[PDB]
Design a protein around this ligand. Sequence first.
Ligand SMILES: [Cl-]
Length: 354
Amino acid sequence: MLHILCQGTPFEIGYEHGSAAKAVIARSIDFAVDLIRGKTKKTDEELKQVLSQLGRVIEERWPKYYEEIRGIAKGAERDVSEIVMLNTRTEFAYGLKAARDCTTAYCQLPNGALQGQNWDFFSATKENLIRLTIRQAGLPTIKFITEAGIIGKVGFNSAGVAVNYNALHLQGLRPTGVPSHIALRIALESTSPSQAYDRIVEQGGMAASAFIMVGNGHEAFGLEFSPTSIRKQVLDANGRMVHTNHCLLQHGKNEKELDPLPDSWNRHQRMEFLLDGFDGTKQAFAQLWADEDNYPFSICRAYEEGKSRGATLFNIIYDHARREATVRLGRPTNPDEMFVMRFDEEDERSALNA
Ligand SMILES: [Cl-]
């Protein structure tokens, strides 16, 4: 997969991403514009002004992330508004829908915890997946998988913090709140899961709804959130956490879950069942993600026109003991490719500002 090493100032980091992924980012934009236009009767000009407002929020609240976004825009030869769109796509789409009218697991194990997910979405975005290695002096070096143009998604850092992301649709939008991809980047820049939690909560509230899991070898948590709820999932009695695309946690009375898919319950039940028979081995853990019970709506999801709109587009497994992450692109039943990510001495020197 296209793998871009980004280092220096936030702007330089963004510029390297934007330049090397220029063609892919053009595709990401084309896809996002199509998605957005399907959600609304609003004119393009009006949408551009909404993007300007959201851009002003990011500029004020997270200057360093905004500078990176400006760099991506410059390198990809696109407007900042287009890159802002990419980085707030879920929120932007939720907002437009409201105006108009993934499977993840962590297992604590004595010989080394395992954590992973399948990411399921519209197949057209699979060809837009890239990976970034980001080195910033004095921060953990980050290695993550993302649709090109986006600054935080699913991956891990040199401090051992590993993150996963699942769609979740609780009602509510706060355009001044922290976007979910900014929260992912905040987590990826933290030195421990507890610091990630503290730093996410520090922002003082979420812009929309999602689920994020943060773990290392020692501890992990899940967060189900809306602009009016931040609830923590913790390990169960078997040392496991499983999350799909619906609320598992107790939320405030006014919280409202919007059109979750029936298979979200099915996959959660299925993964819990599969973990009951799981022997703890890395080989066995990897095989869980290729499960096809209730195909095409399975843990290893398939596109089937008229039935299932999306597919599993990649799988990632964090071997916490070794600080390695194995990525399988496409469906784990027959991956398009497979590679292992790990940190080197230079990744560690950047993190120590040495
Ligand atoms: Cl637009």
